[PDB]
Subunit: 217 residues, 4 copies
């Protein structure tokens, strides 16, 4: 069932809980291949990139089970969600291609919105009126960003509104498809940045004091 | 060398010529796994998805040779270039990562602009930067000519274009994957009125497809 | 249906015809990223690596349709079929995993035999089993005719062949990727005296290559 | 330097230590997409498949640094090492293809040996005389298997002999390139089996009592 009353947006009603990552649990950067521009600044790896992919596969499957045979409009929140969104749509298409169930509806219709008080850079949001919408976000912390953007999308009157977020911090709005629950720390790598740096690093790391001082501004 | 005169933008001066795909050269869709939503509409495949990936690896290496050791700002033109851009940035990061060369600069810095008019963040941050515009296809050359003039006003250090496909139908790219005949393509992020982006291969738009998804 | 009479082995009875690659149809090596050790020797690419992967996905789906819900024993013929086998088993596991169908049987059980004569574990365990022999290429058909007779003696339940390539030069496979002209291929696990297996694309053996790596 | 005196075989002399996985550290199977034939039997995931790939990348790089421009003969121990070996050779070729250093020597020359008192099913081992050999193994526990096979290969007189093993158990011979150090438990998945079952599962799991009883024989 793709239906979900608008009023439920951000409640995480009937969700599958995310993978819980306890406090002070990290891998050492030295065990991974870290590139020279990252070497001085990465010490602790919270989520290896291949752990992120394995988790995204399970989210995708959850998503496909929810919307199969229903038109689905998926919104990528740029820039941060690029990595997670591109993995997710790759899985969604593949799952639908291999599924024994056959549908005449594509697996998803993609959209982009850039968020940076919330700023909204995007096409006219009216195209989402009466559509099933899935917001793909990289990380929710206080919930402010998705609460404001959600309020603005509700105004157009979508048919349904759900949230897929790769990480939620333990500090509030909650996503419907969430990969990981982590302790309240600043993360970089795997598309997470610190003043635009580290996005190209393959793993989700903790921001180091060395990084923070070198790239603060 | 990353340096290149701004006046050379769109001239494809000194480029490596793309892979030339001759007219009326196609693979049969029946030889590929085609999902149900595309099955009635896809007959001819111009570029198998795997061939796209092999060519994008060669372009990433060409781009790595050009910009290695220099700050590189890459602009994705949405929505069409999403797939090419995502493949390209993955190969650039990997190539640098395995190169055995030491650089203190990341392999790229990413940016996004949506064209259809323009929609983007403030463009003045490209001043005195090395910029690579990544696009899905160049046909008349109008889109990149127009966006190019807009960017030239902020005074970048250099401007190049990477385009997966150029049609033989005139602006040209610097890193181009394939030269094809003048036909409307769909699949691998190419669409016909927002349809077929998710198909894994580059195909020609058939009659059946044109009819059902018409204006 | 997994069932198939043992007497039909090698006849390609009821198969889906492979992708036909016409004579003198090649891509230029200069359009691909070719590593230094292959660079002097590779000129023409018959099958880009990505095209191989796209076709292997279609074969895995064909094999999934045939054996789903039945115990399937897959034999890799070493060393040549390593690459095809590894791609095939990855796609079969994934296809089953995402199929949304419930089966209590794994997508395959793997086995290995080395031919050049035979080298393998005891073959009697294939008695009353559904067997799929995975091979890199069939040319005269001698290798699979001979190994086939050996296996037939243990009384399998059914026997089929998956071959990535068949040359038009006669035994034929049941799941075949490509029909090519009669030429010696190298790359993508195809070798010339143990050379070129690691190259990512299927290429023709050139003169330069023949000379340097000769008998 | 590819050189290594034969006498050092199995000592792990001058190795990079593996990634240490503490006792009683597992992920829950429920957080992953587990296929129906595995669902009843997998409970605890020790090493997510994408964690294995990220670690294999770092081993490959270590291996490339050791043998670049030197002829390298790599032996896959079947059936168990298939997964690890195929990931490793894919990385090795790619690293050499992207390397700024150029060599006229291929990244590796592959070989297969099936081990099951040790049984050795293989081509004539004499082809390894005076060659640099790397044995690729899935898991070392007591060290018996690699000690016996190593003794048999020494007899032919290779130039050098090193061991790459994805996992070593904490119970003895040691590998030169080792991915993980784990507690002494029986593992399945990601090519590890229990009486031929579970190899196709994507993650390295702990054998469950339910699995053991269902597949014992
Ligand atoms: O790179 C990042 N590492 C983090 O640890 C982190 N926490 C929050 N964010 C981003 O900052 C904002 C926080 O989201 P909230 O509005 O819910 O507080 C949004 O823009 C979030 O995407 C992060 N970005
Ligand atoms: O999906 C598509 N299939 C095509 O065959 C095709 N040809 C051009 N285009 C898009 O339309 C414009 C063509 O660009 P020009 O300004 O160079 O003519 C740009 O916006 C191009 O992306 C295509 N899009
Ligand atoms: O690398 C290769 N490139 C080729 O073009 C080629 N043609 C045949 N073969 C191998 O030689 C034998 C051919 O099999 P037949 O028994 O069917 O003739 C089998 O052992 C095949 O694997 C090739 N190997
Ligand atoms: O599937 C497996 N899960 C395990 O936990 C495990 N421990 C050892 N092995 C295999 O059994 C033998 C043990 O190696 P040792 O000779 O060093 O004891 C060799 O055949 C090893 O590869 C395992 N296989
Ligand atoms: Mg953001
Ligand atoms: Mg940010
Ligand atoms: Mg466009
Ligand atoms: Mg378009
Ligand atoms: Mg062979
Ligand atoms: Mg051969
Ligand atoms: Mg073994
Ligand atoms: Mg075993």
């Amino acid at each position: 069932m793709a239906s979900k009353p608008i009023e439920d947006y951000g409640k995480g009603k009937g969700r599958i809980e995310p993978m819980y990552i306890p406090d002070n649990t990290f891998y050492n950067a030295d065990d991974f291949l870290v590139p020279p521009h990252c070497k001085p600044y990465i010490d602790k790896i919270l989520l290896p990139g291949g752990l992120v992919k394995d988790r995204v596969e399970k989210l995708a499957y959850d998503i496909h089970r929810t919307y199969f045979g229903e038109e689905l409009h998926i919104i990528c929140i740029l820039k941060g969600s690029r990595g997670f969104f591109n993995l997710l749509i790759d899985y969604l298409a593949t799952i639908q291609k291999y599924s024994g169930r056959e549908s005449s509806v594509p697996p998803f219709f993609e959209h982009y919105v850039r968020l940076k008080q919330l700023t909204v850079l995007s096409d006219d949001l009216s195209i989402f009126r009466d559509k099933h919408v899935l917001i793909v976000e990289d990380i929710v912390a206080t919930g402010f960003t998705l609460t404001e953007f959600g309020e603005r999308l509700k105004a157009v009157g979508p048919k349904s509104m759900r949230i897929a977020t790769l990480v939620e911090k333990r500090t509030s709005l909650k996503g419907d498809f969430v990969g990981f629950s982590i302790e309240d720390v600043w993360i970089v790598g795997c598309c997470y940045d610190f003043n635009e740096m580290f996005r190209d690093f393959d793993h989700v790391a903790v921001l180091s004091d060395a990084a923070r001082k070198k790239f603060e501004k």
